[PDB]
Amino acid sequence: WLRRIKAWLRRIKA
Numbered sequence: 001w002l003r004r005i006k007a008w009l010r011r012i013k014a
Contacts, residue, residue: 005012
């Protein structure tokens with residue numbers, strides 16, 4: 001969750 005969602009941040013555009 002420190003490498004997938006930090007990039008999912010890119011997918012979620014949170």
